[PDB]
Amino acid sequence: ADLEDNMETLNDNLKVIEKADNAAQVKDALTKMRAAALDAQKATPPKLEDKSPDSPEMWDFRHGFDHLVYHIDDALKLANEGKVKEAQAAAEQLKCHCNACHQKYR
Ligand code: HEC
Ligand SMILES: [Cu+2]
Numbered sequence: 042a043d044l045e046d047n048m049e050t051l052n053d054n055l056k057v058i059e060k061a062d063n064a065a066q067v068k069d070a071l072t073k074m075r076a077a078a079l080d081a082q083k084a085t086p087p088k089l090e091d092k093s094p095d096s097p098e099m100w101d102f103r104h105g106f107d108h109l110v111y112h113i114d115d116a117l118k119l120a121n122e123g124k125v126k127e128a129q130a131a132a133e134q135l136k137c138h139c140n141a142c143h144q145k146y147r
Contacts, residue, residue, distance in 0.1 A: 047081035050074065051139070058132045067128045068120040075113045082106035086146050105142045109135060
């Protein structure tokens with residue numbers, strides 16, 4: 042999918058997590074976010090289209106998604122333990138990273 046679509050998936054599923062009634066619902070949303078993060082990691086964002094594919098900026102962009110997956114995996118572990126509120130709280134740690142990448146590269 043394109044980068045915009047993967048971003049919509051990330052945004053929509055974070056809202057699902059916030060409104061969830063159980064940890065399995067959180068897990069289902071996080072699973073979709075994990076895939077969207079890894080698919081977005083394959084894209085070249087418009088603001089970096091003129092940079093080398095091997096540039097420090099492109100590696101920083103790609104590594105931002107690895108860190109999003111770090112947080113998603115943290116939250117998934119908690120969700121799979123049935124810990125709904127803790128999994129929701131772990132997912133909120135994503136937000137600073139959504140905004141930090143946007144500040145650089147959106
Ligand atoms: C870089 C490592 C990113 C991370 C982490 C997140 N996003 Fe992102 N997002 C990124 C870029 C470069 C762009 C612009 C894409 C473009 O083609 O202009 C975006 C955009 C969004 C949007 C707007 C969607 C659109 O239709 O353009 C949303 C709603 C969005 N991003 C959400 C979002 C969330 C919730 C994230 C954390 C869970 C997140 N992004 C991380 C780059 C990066
Ligand atoms: Cu972090």
